[PDB]
Amino acid sequence: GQVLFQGLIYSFNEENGEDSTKPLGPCDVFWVQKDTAIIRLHPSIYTQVFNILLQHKEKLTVQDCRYSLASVTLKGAKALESLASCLRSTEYSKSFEQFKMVSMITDHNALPQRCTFAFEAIDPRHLAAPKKLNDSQRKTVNSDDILSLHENYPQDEINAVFNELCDPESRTQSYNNQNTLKEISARRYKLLTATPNSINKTTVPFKESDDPSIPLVIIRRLKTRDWIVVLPWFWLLPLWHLLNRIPRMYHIGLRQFQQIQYENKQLYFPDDYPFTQLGYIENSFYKKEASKTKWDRKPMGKRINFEKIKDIHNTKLPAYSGEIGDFFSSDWRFLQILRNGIDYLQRNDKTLELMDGVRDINCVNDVLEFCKDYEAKTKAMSLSIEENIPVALCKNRKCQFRTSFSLTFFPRCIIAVSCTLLERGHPKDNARIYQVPEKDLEHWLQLAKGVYRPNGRKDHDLKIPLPEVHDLIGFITSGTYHLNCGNGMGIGFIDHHAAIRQPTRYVLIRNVGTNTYRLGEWSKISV
Amino acid sequence: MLVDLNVPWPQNSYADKVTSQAVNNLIKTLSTLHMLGYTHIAINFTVNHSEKFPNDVKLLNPIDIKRRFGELMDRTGLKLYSRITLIIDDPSKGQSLSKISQAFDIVAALPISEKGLTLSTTNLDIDLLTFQYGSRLPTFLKHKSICSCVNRGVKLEIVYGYALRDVQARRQFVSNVRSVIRSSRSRGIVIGSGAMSPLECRNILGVTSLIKNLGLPSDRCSKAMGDLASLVLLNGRLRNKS
Amino acid sequence: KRVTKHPSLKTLTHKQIHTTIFVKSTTPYVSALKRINKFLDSVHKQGSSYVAVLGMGKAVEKTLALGCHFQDQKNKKIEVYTKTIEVLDEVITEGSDVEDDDKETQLKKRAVSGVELRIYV
Amino acid sequence: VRLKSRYILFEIIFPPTDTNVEESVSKADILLSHHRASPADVSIKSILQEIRRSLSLNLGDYGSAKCNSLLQLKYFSNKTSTGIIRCHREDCDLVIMALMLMSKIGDVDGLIVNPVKVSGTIKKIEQFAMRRNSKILNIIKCSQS
RNA sequence: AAUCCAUGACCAAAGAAUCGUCACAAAUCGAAGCUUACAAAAUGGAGUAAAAUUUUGUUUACUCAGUAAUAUGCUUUGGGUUGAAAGUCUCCCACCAAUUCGUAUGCGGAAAACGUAAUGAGAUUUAAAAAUAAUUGUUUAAAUCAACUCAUUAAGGAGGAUGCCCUUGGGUAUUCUGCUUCUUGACCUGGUACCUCUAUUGCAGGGUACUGGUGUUUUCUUCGGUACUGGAUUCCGUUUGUAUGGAAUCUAAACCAUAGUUAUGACGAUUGCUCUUUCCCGUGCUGGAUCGAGUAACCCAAUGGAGCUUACUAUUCUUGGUCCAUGGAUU
Numbered sequence A: 001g002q003v004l005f006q007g008l009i010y011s012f013n014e015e016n017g018e019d020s021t022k023p024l025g026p027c028d029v030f031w032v033q034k035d036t037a038i039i040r041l042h043p044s045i046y047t048q049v050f051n052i053l054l055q056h057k058e059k060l061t062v063q064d065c066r067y068s069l070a071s072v073t074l075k076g077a078k079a080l081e082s083l084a085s086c087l088r089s090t091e092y093s094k095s096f097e098q099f100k101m102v103s104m105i106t107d108h109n110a111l112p113q114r115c116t117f118a119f120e121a122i123d124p125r126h127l128a129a130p131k132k133l134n135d136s137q138r139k140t141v142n143s144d145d146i147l148s149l150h151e152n153y154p155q156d157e158i159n160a161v162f163n164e165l166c167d168p169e170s171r172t173q174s175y176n177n178q179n180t181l182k183e184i185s186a187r188r189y190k191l192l193t194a195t196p197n198s199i200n201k202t203t204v205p206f207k208e209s210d211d212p213s214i215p216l217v218i219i220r221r222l223k224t225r226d227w228i229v230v231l232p233w234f235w236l237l238p239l240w241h242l243l244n245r246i247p248r249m250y251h252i253g254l255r256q257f258q259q260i261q262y263e264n265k266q267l268y269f270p271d272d273y274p275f276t277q278l279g280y281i282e283n284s285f286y287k288k289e290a291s292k293t294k295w296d297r298k299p300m301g302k303r304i305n306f307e308k309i310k311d312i313h314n315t316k317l318p319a320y321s322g323e324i325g326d327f328f329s330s331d332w333r334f335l336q337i338l339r340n341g342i343d344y345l346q347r348n349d350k351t352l353e354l355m356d357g358v359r360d361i362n363c364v365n366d367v368l369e370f371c372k373d374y375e376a377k378t379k380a381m382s383l384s385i386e387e388n389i390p391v392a393l394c395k396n397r398k399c400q401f402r403t404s405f406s407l408t409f410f411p412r413c414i415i416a417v418s419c420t421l422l423e424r425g426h427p428k429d430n431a432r433i434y435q436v437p438e439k440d441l442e443h444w445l446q447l448a449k450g451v452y453r454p455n456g457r458k459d460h461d462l463k464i465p466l467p468e469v470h471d472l473i474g475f476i477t478s479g480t481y482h483l484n485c486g487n488g489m490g491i492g493f494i495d496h497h498a499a500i501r502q503p504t505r506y507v508l509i510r511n512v513g514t515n516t517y518r519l520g521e522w523s524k525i526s527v
Numbered sequence B: 001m002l003v004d005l006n007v008p009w010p011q012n013s014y015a016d017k018v019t020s021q022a023v024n025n026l027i028k029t030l031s032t033l034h035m036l037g038y039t040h041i042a043i044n045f046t047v048n049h050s051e052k053f054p055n056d057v058k059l060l061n062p063i064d065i066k067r068r069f070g071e072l073m074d075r076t077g078l079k080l081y082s083r084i085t086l087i088i089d090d091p092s093k094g095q096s097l098s099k100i101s102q103a104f105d106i107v108a109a110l111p112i113s114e115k116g117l118t119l120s121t122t123n124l125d126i127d128l129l130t131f132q133y134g135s136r137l138p139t140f141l142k143h144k145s146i147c148s149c150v151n152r153g154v155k156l157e158i159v160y161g162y163a164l165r166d167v168q169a170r171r172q173f174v175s176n177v178r179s180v181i182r183s184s185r186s187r188g189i190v191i192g193s194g195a196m197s198p199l200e201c202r203n204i205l206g207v208t209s210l211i212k213n214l215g216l217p218s219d220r221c222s223k224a225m226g227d228l229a230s231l232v233l234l235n236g237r238l239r240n241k242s
Numbered sequence C: 001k002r003v004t005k006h007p008s009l010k011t012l013t014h015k016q017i018h019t020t021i022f023v024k025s026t027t028p029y030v031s032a033l034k035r036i037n038k039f040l041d042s043v044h045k046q047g048s049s050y051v052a053v054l055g056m057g058k059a060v061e062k063t064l065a066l067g068c069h070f071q072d073q074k075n076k077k078i079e080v081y082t083k084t085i086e087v088l089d090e091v092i093t094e095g096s097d098v099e100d101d102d103k104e105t106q107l108k109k110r111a112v113s114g115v116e117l118r119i120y121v
Numbered sequence D: 001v002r003l004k005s006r007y008i009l010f011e012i013i014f015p016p017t018d019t020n021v022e023e024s025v026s027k028a029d030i031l032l033s034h035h036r037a038s039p040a041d042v043s044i045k046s047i048l049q050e051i052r053r054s055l056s057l058n059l060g061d062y063g064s065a066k067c068n069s070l071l072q073l074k075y076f077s078n079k080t081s082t083g084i085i086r087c088h089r090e091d092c093d094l095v096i097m098a099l100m101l102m103s104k105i106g107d108v109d110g111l112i113v114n115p116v117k118v119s120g121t122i123k124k125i126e127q128f129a130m131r132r133n134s135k136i137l138n139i140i141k142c143s144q145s
Numbered sequence E: 001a002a003u004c005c006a007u008g009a010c011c012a013a014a015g016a017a018u019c020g021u022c023a024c025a026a027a028u029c030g031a032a033g034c035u036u037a038c039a040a041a042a043u044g045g046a047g048u049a050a051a052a053u054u055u056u057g058u059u060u061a062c063u064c065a066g067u068a069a070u071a072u073g074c075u076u077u078g079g080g081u082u083g084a085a086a087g088u089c090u091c092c093c094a095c096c097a098a099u100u101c102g103u104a105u106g107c108g109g110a111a112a113a114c115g116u117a118a119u120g121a122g123a124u125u126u127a128a129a130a131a132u133a134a135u136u137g138u139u140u141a142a143a144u145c146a147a148c149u150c151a152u153u154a155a156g157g158a159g160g161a162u163g164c165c166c167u168u169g170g171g172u173a174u175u176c177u178g179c180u181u182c183u184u185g186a187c188c189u190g191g192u193a194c195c196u197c198u199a200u201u202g203c204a205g206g207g208u209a210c211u212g213g214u215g216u217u218u219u220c221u222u223c224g225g226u227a228c229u230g231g232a233u234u235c236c237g238u239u240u241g242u243a244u245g246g247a248a249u250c251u252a253a254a255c256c257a258u259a260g261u262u263a264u265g266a267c268g269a270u271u272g273c274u275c276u277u278u279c280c281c282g283u284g285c286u287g288g289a290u291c292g293a294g295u296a297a298c299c300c301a302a303u304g305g306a307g308c309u310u311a312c313u314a315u316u317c318u319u320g321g322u323c324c325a326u327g328g329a330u331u
């Protein structure tokens, strides 16, 4: 079906008879003619992908496309109604016959997954004004047309356009006669006097000899829910001009792209993805150093004091006395070492004690001291020698979830979940995710059901049952007030062992400086 | 929602029979309270501690809201409750609360002497404590008794209606309400309107501004009034049912 | 058997979408009242006459509730119409440990009854 | 640094103080018997003088001097008995208490002054007044049936 | 001359955070949001119980989506918001293989009457500041330092010399020779040669290739081309050619801020910071606990972003460093 998908790429490394796989990141792979495969992804990891590909090129042909093929993304409901008014076809084609009707659908989710329309379009500067297409069969649009769209598909012409875009000879021939703005203005001025002296034409006709044929590609993505149009490098500017010329189109940026992709449920390679190598490495570095510089920038008595915050954990320990993790970044090294120490404690004996080369730990304070001395040693040289958090999206199905004194050797897999606040509270990034205890299980259930005042309104003015410290199961990376539902959406990553531990889906959220615990429910995301 | 807990009934004794004009004036003033905007109304009936209580249960309340105000209740859409205050002077002619607590919903008191305050703070199953704001207070409002009666749950009731009667008693009412605010330390303060005429009832904004300028913070006024009136209505209904 | 359901084809020109509330099954009552009041106020500056209220399936009951609320509360003429909605469902047909999400697809039409509710000013 | 103003909306309500005449118990009937009309002897300088007298009599000398610096009646008409008085944000509670303590007019007796909406802008006051006027018509239309 | 202590002068950074409450099927000092309509119960759903009917079929009485929705409620935030909202400062917010600053010019930058780096000099006796465009109460300097202004240094690769760790060798900094970085373009006048239109020619106008010249380019401040960017509906032609084009009627909107039009209110409670008051272990500890005060000043948005300048911090909150400034002590 040659449909576009967005999956998780890996860096495979097999010399002879040994295979070790590392999490690389995202990628978009597309097949054409069963032999031409295109792979598009982030440049920083694209360099490594190209390197590991060129390392094995004895029976394989590689082609880089960084300054000869480009793509632009459209989002919204009326995104295709302007792309149609901008694009014009050179001669009759079935791809355009389907795209014309698709432009009137107005709903992207109604269309099926397989929808790729490619053809040869006219120059964007050829058009004077963005004239809209024929709109008279708008009412007679039923499901039979969409049902037939999956059957009727011109594979031949679309494959020819794809092969023309891949081959570097036709891609260069496309630049045969690239008319200048002065030439187009002269053509528009000479068409003022045509042989039919009855109709005013402001456009200019197409020529089979003195005109360049420009190939376009249009693909729909199911995950990002957007329409990506691919076009050569030097041809993108004229299309972009006429696209932005539409008075319902603004330019979306990487920050607004982040807002959009955070809106639905989606994730990011550099910022959100905490388990890949490049993403987590540069995330931890850049964010930690930036926050630390902004923190040391302000003087004493002017910044929030993470070190001195009372009433954070019940039965306070004399180890940190402030924040348990890192003051700036959501650190998973402390999380994994703490959980490893807790697992060791439960493995030596059924119960855990709080207060009493490296010592044989008998209390969680020794685990906190181990975390602290490890971080103090790390304060000098590189961090993350192997990893801190992997992702097990398939291994539990592969064999099983499987849980001598290192505390930092084996990592702890995490699942991508989304926690939604069901009551009063506002989340932020680098937030802590705690698990609801067993003794105070009915109080949170009653708070989630309802507790009103005798006046009638809700009641949030009560005493909070502060939980213990050994309840860290996750960290929220993208915490921002959700505007699509009216509550606070939290994008975190919880542990699978603690997910199976609890018999309920309730979970507590806390900030990095705030000492209040909000209640919510998390939902698993299959990404 | 707003709650009024101090609507007086035009009848002092039990031999006192009601007059149709008094019932009409009470209907007028309740309609005016509902017009200014209210949800809960609790009419009060005054009685003397020296008067003989009847040997009845079916006749303790000469109100019978169901037969008189039961039509207004489902027409205009409000509620009415039973409340009785006790004008207590000295420890005599009494020693009966278990039979007056089952008939009515809210039980109040009106101490006017030295021993009256002590007996009100000692062994009286009361909810609200009311003082004579019109005339002078008995001796002096101190913390030793007020703190002890507020820590158990009994609140102090303030009548902003007595001020709008004449011009001379305004000074005494102010000097008494400020003493009550200074002694109670602004925790257990509930307010009511003891007006019998529809010309002496105000809205929430005016009353709030008055009590704010008289010595009570804006948080105390709102929170106390609303939640404490709702809670006293709730516990009265609960002790009436069970 | 695994089968997913996509939404129904919505073809709105420029203004039929504006003066129209699509009542979901999870949409609260008071939010619907607020948005209906906003639409009722903004219609005659949008240039329409009525406010469309479309709901299908589980939300039909509370859609009729919203209708009969404004029927007598604000004394505004209401018009109820019974329509049919065709929805496309994507099912897997039987014909290697592969994820069930990435499998062969077949489209099937399903007709459901729905209520359109117009409110005048 | 910036002059902060705050307008107060007040209404004159006449209670049906007549014990010889029985009254109908409903919403719109009491709304109509409470919003009947204002008397002819009603003006802006006659209400401002009365409220100034009441303020000087209840608060005192300095209490009236501090509020009478920016105490003006911006908009008021006797047809519906709704007025908008301008005052400062510091003495707004004092003006509300003075409106509450308004006893009677020099010639007209038996009336209540009700403060409804208070804010620091006239646009929102006008919007709330229009909303209240629209809400008033609903019970009237419902009861006319 | 070295170190320490106290004061004063000058440069640079930042503008503490958390919780709860406020009547009206609507409200508040305000604001936003809870709308890609379905519980696969529409391929004319799945079954149970009774009567009658020679089974079907028909009439009554029920079960199933249960993680179920819960009626003006509910969640969020709101004056420095990128530390100055302040200020008669500058600029972007349509393109233009080019009469359109076609500007490879120290670096960064789309631009900036923009930031910074190395060297030399300067003070109404000067390139220019004073005692014949913006801003600032004082408004650069004029022993040395510090600050302002102006005048030079084009990007990358290769060879030699010097200095440092190091003495196979390699790395960094400076300086000299020198190559690579190539869109047949200041503007304008005259002559010659070729082609097209005005429907024969000499001639009239435009384009291109070449040569010659300062040629009154003294309007020393904008003067080039193209572009219907709100919404609704109707008419007509089409496998003879273009697979889409032609034209018509009516309205007025384009209304958009994780503050938005001068609104950002009222108090209560908790944590943190400065100095002083005392105690303790082990001198000391971003140590703990009381007894207190302070949490300031400059000033406030009206479309958005960047640069610069100017106001701020004396018991009227703070922090870091420097000083060929003085004061005391030791060597």
Ligand SMILES: [Mg+2]
Pocket (backbone or CB within 6 Å): none
């Ligand atoms: Mg301004």
